[model samples]
Target: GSSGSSGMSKKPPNRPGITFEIGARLEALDYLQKWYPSRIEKIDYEEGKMLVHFERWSHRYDEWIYWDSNRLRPLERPALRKEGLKDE
Candidate 1:
């Protein structure tokens, strides 16, 4: 299994799906922010829901807001970075 933060081994075990698709509600779920977890919806949905890998006290935790299961489907051909820069 792929490894991520907060003991997550799978890429997004609860991504939006055909059955429980986007705009769906998962009440009382545990969500992790840049470095903390909660169900408080820190996301600014009117503009967009984004949580960068960097928190006020850390950086490059390697987790992306877009990778959150609460978001839509993942990239079919997602970019792969082996070094510190984009592959271009």
Candidate 2:
């Protein structure tokens, strides 16, 4: 199911597809930003989704994001990084 943030009953029209296929890679900064660091605790290939867990400002939460196998986008700001240099 698509999230309401995209305003579409299906996935976002412009959403990038999965990046795990041959010769594919995740878009830089797409999963890494100033928000927080998240770990891919589990991947469900049958469901085409991933479980990501992260903590921010002493709070922790998990989210699931959908994935496709044939599309991808390159990041524009590959050098962007968070303030703290720790990963946990």
Candidate 3:
């Protein structure tokens, strides 16, 4: 049996309608209007490449999703916070 937690911890996000951006994580689902916590698997330094992974609350089909840093969002709790309090 598994215990504790794995992957990046899902950061509790309150901002609504926020899209995936260069320096953002996928916190909730805009379409379903649900709080779907997720995690940013990886991201390029130029803010042009990103790979997001959803948490247990979400991630129905696939756990991996790709997005560009130029476009737009928060996907999860974020196990690691490189940019202190970037959640602002």
Candidate 4:
């Protein structure tokens, strides 16, 4: 028989990880791509924060941008969208 009632006692406890989902109107894609593509990892409307994930080499970690719903305007996608890719 085992010394302990459960063999799992020796194992470490599991830590819960966070998951985020972002929702934005279609229009915001352009402004997002220009100023905040890689920077933004997730957005939570319920929490009222824009979760920003910083680059590893850069001197920053993740941050939250809190704002009221009215403050954020629909992002504009302009002619930039039509620009051709260099490889293409």
Candidate 1 lowest-lDDT run of ten: 18-27
Per-residue C-alpha lDDT of model 4 across residues 7-86, encoded as one tens digit per residue? 33222123132222354322112224443322445665565567655443266665665432222233343355665756
- Scored against the true structure, residue 67 in model 3 reaches a CA lDDT of 45
Q: Is candidate 3 or candidate 4 better by TM-score?
A: 4
Q: Write the residue-wise lDDT of candidate 3 on 1-88 in tens digits.
A: 8653223213222436455444355553534555555555655435434465545544353333434212224334535646676656
Clashing pairs in 2: 18-68
TM-score of each: 0.18, 0.36, 0.31, 0.31
Candidate 1: give its CA RMSD in angstroms. Answer: 15.4
Candidate 2 similarity to native, TM-score: 0.36
> Which of 1 and 2 is the better model by lDDT?
2
Report the lDDT of model 3 for residue 20: 47
The TM-score, computed over Cα atoms with residue i paired to residue i, of candidate 1 is 0.18
Error of 3 at 48 (Å): 2.0
Pitting candidate 1 against candidate 4, the one with the higher TM-score is 4
Question: Residue 14 of model 1: what lDDT?
Answer: 46
Q: Where is model 2 more than 4 Å wrong at Cα?
A: 1-34, 68-88
For candidate 2, the clash count comes to: 1
Query: Residue 7 in candidate 1 has what lDDT?
Result: 41
- Candidates in order have lDDT scores of 0.34, 0.45, 0.44, 0.39
Superposed model 1: Cα runs more than 4 Å off: 1-41, 54-88
